[PDB]
Amino acid sequence: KETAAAKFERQHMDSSTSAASSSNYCNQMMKSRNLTKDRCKPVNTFVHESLADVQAVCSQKNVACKNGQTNCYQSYSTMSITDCRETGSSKYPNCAYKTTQANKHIIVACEGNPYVPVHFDASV
């Protein structure tokens, strides 16, 4: 079992490290958060901010989700994130990723009560 909101923290939150760790961050993180379990998840983003900072984006700038829903919110501030991007030669079960660190605004979809992030939509 697993709530959508737990899944968001599992998939997208890394507050313990405040930037990317190293060339191997993505390889390590995609495995340990279990994003290489069934296949090689081709792309994923990690957010190095506090939980409370990320959850607060649910009350920041309301924008359209890529799927046309209306419950997406963009961060007023840039955030430290790491994009993990599965390489060409990555072959499951040996999933291999390029680690890009950047500071970008994030876009998340929020739901529930409390109203919290359930989906990482984009970064800009």
Curated annotation (Swiss-Prot):
Main localisation: secreted
Glycosylation sites (chain numbering): K1, K7, N34, K37, K41
Keywords assigned by UniProt, alphabetized: Disulfide bond, Endonuclease, Glycation, Glycoprotein, Hydrolase, Lyase, Nuclease, Secreted, Signal
Catalyzed reaction equations: an [RNA] containing cytidine + H2O = an [RNA]-3'-cytidine-3'-phosphate + a 5'-hydroxy-ribonucleotide-3'-[RNA]; an [RNA] containing uridine + H2O = an [RNA]-3'-uridine-3'-phosphate + a 5'-hydroxy-ribonucleotide-3'-[RNA]
GO cellular component: extracellular region
Localization per Swiss-Prot or TrEMBL: Secreted
Oligomeric form and interacting partners: Interacts with and forms tight 1:1 complexes with RNH1. Dimerization of two such complexes may occur. Interaction with RNH1 inhibits this protein. Monomer.
Protein name: Ribonuclease pancreatic
Organism: Bos taurus (Bovine)
Gene encoding the protein: RNASE1
